[PDB]
Design a protein around this ligand. Structure first.
Ligand SMILES: COc1nc(Nc2ccc(C(=O)N(C)C)cc2)ncc1-c1cc(C(=O)O)cs1
Ligand SMILES: [Cl-]
Length: 327
């Protein structure tokens, strides 16, 4: 009939044993405060659904980021807000400081803590072996926490990891694609950003879980230790799987789709071809050798797997020999 069902190996029934007020974001009442307290100093950037500004709070003159929202369906706004409130105070989770509206324009905005970020294309080249280990462990704390809280980030990528290198402070940001995990649920596979999408999304396997974030983290790690950003560089979602298949090999791909009885797109038949598994040592060279080790490769190996169930969980990852030098 259809695909074989799947469950998360960790934190499976975490939302199931909690009351609906926790996960039923659609019934959440959002209270919009006054934006007057925040004066905009300068623009930082602009997202697909918002425009981010640096701002200062006139109440206490503390630095802040204001995410002025474009018109979006209130269901998705309620979802992001509820997830941000549920996860507030957690390790390395960006703090939602306030929910506000401009009195006159009525335009809704989310207020966040400010992180004195260093652009990742400048920063990542500077990072030592110990730095990559340190920051990966900070990300794993955020992910294990949010996973334990029954939430998938679903958009892990360098753009969503704010790092203040001077203060060694890391914050996982932009929970706009995040979602509550309910075992059995068939989710929308159009999440994450192309280069960081797990094979489950690309073959359209809907019953995915927290392990989607661990694939994406693996993509980040590969890019950092090998100095190849992005690591998997497809021209579209179809070609993204081809790029993956040219590294992990096509045999394990077809074993994966066979195991889960995944209905593969006809377009894939032509474009995937046949590719052997390329060893991780093939990506090590004179300019990245210093960032690579047996433990780094073994860690990466256990993140970048087709089978989502076979990937390290966040808690398992934090116990890997790679982090023995950090913790
Ligand atoms: C743009 O996004 C952010 N940026 C920052 N800091 C900075 C970003 C960029 C520079 C820089 O390099 N200059 C000088 C432009 C400096 C600081 N701090 C928090 C966020 C958040 C995003 C989100 C979100 O999407 O949810 C919640 S906070
Ligand atoms: Cl969605």
């Amino acid at each position: 009939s259809g695909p074989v069902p799947s469950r998360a190996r960790v934190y499976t029934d975490v939302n199931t044993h909690r009351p609906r007020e926790y996960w039923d974001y659609e019934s959440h009442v959002v209270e919009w405060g006054n934006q007057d307290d925040y004066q905009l100093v300068r623009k930082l950037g602009r997202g697909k659904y918002s425009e981010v500004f640096e701002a200062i709070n006139i109440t206490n003159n503390e630095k802040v980021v204001v995410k002025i929202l474009k018109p979006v369906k209130k269901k998705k706004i309620k979802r992001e807000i509820k997830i941000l409130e549920n996860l507030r105070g957690g390790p390395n989770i960006i703090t939602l400081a306030d929910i506000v509206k401009d009195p006159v324009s009525r335009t809704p905005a989310l207020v966040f803590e400010h992180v004195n970020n260093t652009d990742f294309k400048q920063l990542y080249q500077t990072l030592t072996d110990y730095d990559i280990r340190f920051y990966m462990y900070e990300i794993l704390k955020a992910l294990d926490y949010c996973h334990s809280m029954g939430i998938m980030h679903r958009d892990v990528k360098p753009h969503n990891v704010m790092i203040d290198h001077e203060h060694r402070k890391l914050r996982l940001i932009d929970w706009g694609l995040a979602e509550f995990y309910h075992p059995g649920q068939e989710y929308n596979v159009r999440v994450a950003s192309r280069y960081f999408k797990g094979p489950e999304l690309l073959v359209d396997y809907q019953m995915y879980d927290y392990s989607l974030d661990m694939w994406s983290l693996g993509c980040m790690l590969a890019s950092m230790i090998f100095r190849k950003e992005p690591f998997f560089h497809g021209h579209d979602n179809y070609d993204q799987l081809v790029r993956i298949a040219k590294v992990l090999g096509t045999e394990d791909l077809y074993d994966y789709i066979d195991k889960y009885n995944i209905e593969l797109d006809p377009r894939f038949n032509d474009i995937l071809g046949r590719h052997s598994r390329k060893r991780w040592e093939r990506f090590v060279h004179s300019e990245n050798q210093h960032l690579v080790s047996p433990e780094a490769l073994d860690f990466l190996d256990k993140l970048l797997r087709y089978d989502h169930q076979s990937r390290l969980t966040a808690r398992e990852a934090m116990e890997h020999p790679y982090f023995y030098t950090v913790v």
